[PDB]
Amino acid sequence: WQNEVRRFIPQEKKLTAGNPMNFLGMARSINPAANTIPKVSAQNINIEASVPRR
Amino acid sequence: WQNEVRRFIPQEKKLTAGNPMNFLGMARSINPAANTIPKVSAQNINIEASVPRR
């Protein structure tokens, strides 16, 4: 006793080939170690010997 | 140091006139009165006079 409510929004779409969905969770398994925020002044670098003279 | 973490999903395509999505909330605005489940079994109806005869 019901009617399958006719869906025009394509809801419940399986993750097909091409979707990075299938890697998101495994990326969660990977959990990449994002590097810390660098603290570089970029204001006191005396650029006369910090540049290599090879 | 704000960063824009762009998500998986494609940018949602702008709603158009033809799509009934713009009417969807209107439907919830309507909230049309549904109908109860008719409780008739048709077994106790006998087809000799229950059918109209005029």
Partner: protein, 161 residues
Amino acid sequence: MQDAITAVINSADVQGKYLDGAAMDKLKSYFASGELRVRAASVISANAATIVKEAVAKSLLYSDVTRPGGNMYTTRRYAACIRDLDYYLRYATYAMLAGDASILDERVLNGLKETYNSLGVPISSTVQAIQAIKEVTASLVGADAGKEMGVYLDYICSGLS
């Protein structure tokens, strides 16, 4: 036109010979197909409108194709494409029960690409229309019968595409 049985007949007759062993075995193969093809034809004829209905509902329906600007717009072109899908389904059934695609390219492919280009019909959109028709038929005819439905409808698409 011609089907597999007529194919063996005229293949033998062009050389003016009787039924050799090769014709004998391909007739055996077609007869072995037999009841499967006719049962698939009957099941297709049963819910004949249903295949086209859910094929439209899956791919074409509720999209820019059926929206303003798309070739599906207005009731006239909607009914026209429904009639086109009915032609495609009936002729696919005929080719299946015959087992040959001569009916398709003698009754469909001749000028259909150019006749759609004259009307500017989307060839690709029709392509996935027959595509959706493929699985809508396969969900009611089985796997092998559905497989041959897919083969013939793919031939129809390739002729159209």
